[PDB]
RNA sequence: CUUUAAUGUUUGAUGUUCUAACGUUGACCCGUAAUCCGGGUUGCGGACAGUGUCUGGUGGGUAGUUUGACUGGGCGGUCUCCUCCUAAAGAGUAACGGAGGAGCACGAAGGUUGGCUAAUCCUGGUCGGACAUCAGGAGGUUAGUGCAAUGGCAUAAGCCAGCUUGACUGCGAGCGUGACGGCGCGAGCAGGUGCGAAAGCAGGUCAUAGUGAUCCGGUGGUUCUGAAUGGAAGGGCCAUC
RNA sequence: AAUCCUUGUCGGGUAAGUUCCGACUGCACGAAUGGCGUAAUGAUGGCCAGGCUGUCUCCACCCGAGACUCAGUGAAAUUGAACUCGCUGUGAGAUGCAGUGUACCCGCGGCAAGACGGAAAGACCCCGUAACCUUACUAUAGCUUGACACUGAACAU
RNA sequence: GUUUAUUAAAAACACAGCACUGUGCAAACACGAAAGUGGACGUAUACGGUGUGACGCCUCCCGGUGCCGGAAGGUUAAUU
RNA sequence: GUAACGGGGCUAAACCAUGCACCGAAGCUGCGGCAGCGACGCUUAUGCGUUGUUGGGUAGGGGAGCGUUCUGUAAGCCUG
RNA sequence: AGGACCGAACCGACUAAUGAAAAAUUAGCGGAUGACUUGUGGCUGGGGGUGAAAGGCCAAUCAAACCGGGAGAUAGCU
RNA sequence: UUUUGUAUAAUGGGUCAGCGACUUAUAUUCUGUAGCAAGGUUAACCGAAUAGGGGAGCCGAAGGGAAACCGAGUCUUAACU
RNA sequence: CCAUAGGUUAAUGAGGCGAACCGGGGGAACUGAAACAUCUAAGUACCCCGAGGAAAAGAAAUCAACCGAGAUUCCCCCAG
């Protein structure tokens, strides 16, 4: 289980986030995907952040 | 709740929710119970006097349950919509 | 003496109109990111107790 | 020994047979591959599970040049 | 700000001396006919020692306990999950029966649109050779599938490329499957997206392994709650560790 | 050897010695949980010889005390009930079943093959989620560290 | 010499002797919540602990675990 | 201890084939009796004509009773 | 002189065979001026004592005495 | 008695007589039965008193939600076919 | 030195026993948790001190909730 996990956070300014895994050795750069925010009820960009 | 050594059903499952201390002082009043009081006016005190709700009760609703025939003056209490309509039909008054 | 309730049972169950018992599902507390969302969604709502273990529940909970 | 292991049985196989009336949604077959293929009014799930998309009678049939088993639903 | 010197005052500790706490299992006197005890005088020691409370260490000296099951008892081996056979042509089915795998991986190795078709062999061809790359043919999946096996797969599920985030949020008729906990499949509906001219497809990946109940907490959001009242703490609910 | 292989091999002792004594690949001696010697001592272990013998070849006789009989007194363990034989089978080792054989009823003295005889809810073995006896876990008396208290005064660095 | 009173008297224990180690006296240590008592009315030619065990000839490794000594650095309680 | 037909014994009283008799169980039938559960129909004292059928039973479930002591009924009734 | 020798009392208990005896008998056996034996009284108390050490002994009881109490401990066993 | 299974040579009983083991209390549920019935019922206590009083309370007549809250609906969800 | 300690008299009281109940000082383990250590058993058993016919407690630096109650003790509810 070397592939550690992260949380994609909404750029909408809501608290909402998704959580997922990634391989931080092979992929240093941050993951940015356009996902659905259900609080805003729109598709927003989500940026990786540390799960903590 | 002993199932051999298998972990029993209650312990399997979550705890959830919390107890409301406000719930223990609320009350639910039938339309039928509006006749039980005297004077045709319905305050929390009157109901308590009429042993309908109880002494430690700060709040009480009137629900559309049973039926009310006599006109009643409902005072200082919550009423559902259907209960309110029923009261109006009977010829009653409602006031906060 | 009075029967003592099983307090944990009390915490975990609530009786319903027809003498049933609702309860929250397991498996929706932690390790979650690996769980598919659908499964999570379905777990969320409260669930009735099954016929098989109903009796145990009752025994735990005499005053309901 | 090195051999004690085995997996839990998955209870695959045809669930409803030829000329079974089914409700839409009901599963007709559990299978690993597409041993049976989806015909009319029968959907194929992500685990190749064939299921009725409409209420009717199950209808097994061989079709096509490859001579493949096809489950369809006869209208009802 | 880097760096020090001056005047004024302020804790921390370090030994030297003291004598008044404290010690005396030194001496003498008295209670006293008394090697106890106390009082007195005195010497020595002396703020140490030693006692209390808190505190780190050590502590089988002593105490309370634990030290799995299967098993043709111990030793050895095994314990969850996936594939095949045993399994008697629905399902299921045992053995310390026979054979192998898993405790993940992938922001593409997912979605969608467009395109393509394998192994191996033969003949010819610079270095080049059994085995690179290039031609002509035979072959017809004998190949490939991220990894075991099975079942699948050309309408490819196999191989390339373009654009992308449906690896969506709320739900869900109806089924399958379990003693239960649970697990699984799912058309359709709402919202909002991507590919496509469109019909459509997309709620991860050909499928079946890649996993851990509850409690206790942790983080973020949420006025749901808030023990006189307003707040807060704590609790609940949603997401997550 | 207070050494598996092993009755090691060689020698002595015996007609014949897995023991004993003397010598020569330490499974796995070894130096104060002492090594190797050692006069004396030992109800100490092992081996050999002289003497002695009923230990034995191989038992015989005799003397007493019981056993036996008479009179008096008078227990005990055990006990489902018994009209309580052999054999071969059966049923997992038969007085009691089948087939068959044998056998008039009842004492007394003797023996001990069986009644899975009596005696003790097996001591071995296993099981079950007791007791005593280390670098298991958790504690702890004790020992020890510092901090504050009882506990003060100067002086210097 | 002693020993399992009642299945073991021995090669077991003890022994004189040897060695190590502690202990400066209010000794170490031991019994005692303590007071106190033993040690001992003794004082290192003494007392305690451990091992070995008349007499004779004798008797490499400090890495491990203990103990002893050291305290430069690291880490480290209460407290603040 | 015969001891590998249960024995006697058997040349069929063995084996094969065909046939007709009989024996043979707590099976079936016959006669008598009891009880359970259903049907219908009486016309009732809540059961009766009947009419089918059932009635082996451990764990265990359900149903209905006997008897004992004591309290009432009972200063009653029986009893030198 | 002697934890010297032989050997009665006295103390023990190596071999042997055999209820009067809940450990004895007879025949033999060891020590027998000593680390001996014995009378009377005293002291040590139960996780405690004492132990020339065997887990021995502590009232016919000992890897934790006996009496009473918690106590009808608990017994998935018979 | 225990067992898959006992004439068993597996357990127990020498015999008789006497005694010897599913109770009681309080809670809770279900069944029957009786009472009253959208109501039912009192507890301590008072009352020399099994009466009567005593309705403090409890159960029921409404549920849904974690909860605020709403209420024959409610929760879910922005909203539900 | 005065004093004090001490000493001799005199008066008053106590001492010891006793069933349970009561207040205080100490305080287990078995057991349950299907093991076991927090926890339970339980402030129980037990030991000790003291008292009375009763004891203890007792006259709000108490509750309550913006209304109010009005010392302690005991019983029924609240409520498993």
TrEMBL record, chain A:
One of its GO terms (molecular function) is structural constituent of ribosome. One of its GO terms (biological process) is translation. SUPFAM superfamilies: Zn-binding ribosomal proteins. Belongs to the bacterial ribosomal protein bL33 family. PANTHER family: 54S RIBOSOMAL PROTEIN L39, MITOCHONDRIAL (PTHR15238), LARGE RIBOSOMAL SUBUNIT PROTEIN BL33M (PTHR15238:SF1). HAMAP family: Ribosomal_bL33. This is Large ribosomal subunit protein bL33. It comes from Escherichia coli.
UniProtKB/TrEMBL annotation, chain B:
Keywords: Metal-binding, Ribonucleoprotein, Ribosomal protein, RNA-binding, rRNA-binding. One of its GO terms (biological process) is translation. Signal peptide: none annotated. Mg(2+) 4 binds at residue 51. GO terms for cellular component: cytosolic large ribosomal subunit. Transmembrane segments: none annotated. Residues 36-95 form the Large ribosomal subunit protein uL15/eL18 domain. One of its GO terms (molecular function) is rRNA binding. Belongs to the universal ribosomal protein uL15 family. Part of the 50S ribosomal subunit. Binds to the 23S rRNA. This is Large ribosomal subunit protein uL15.
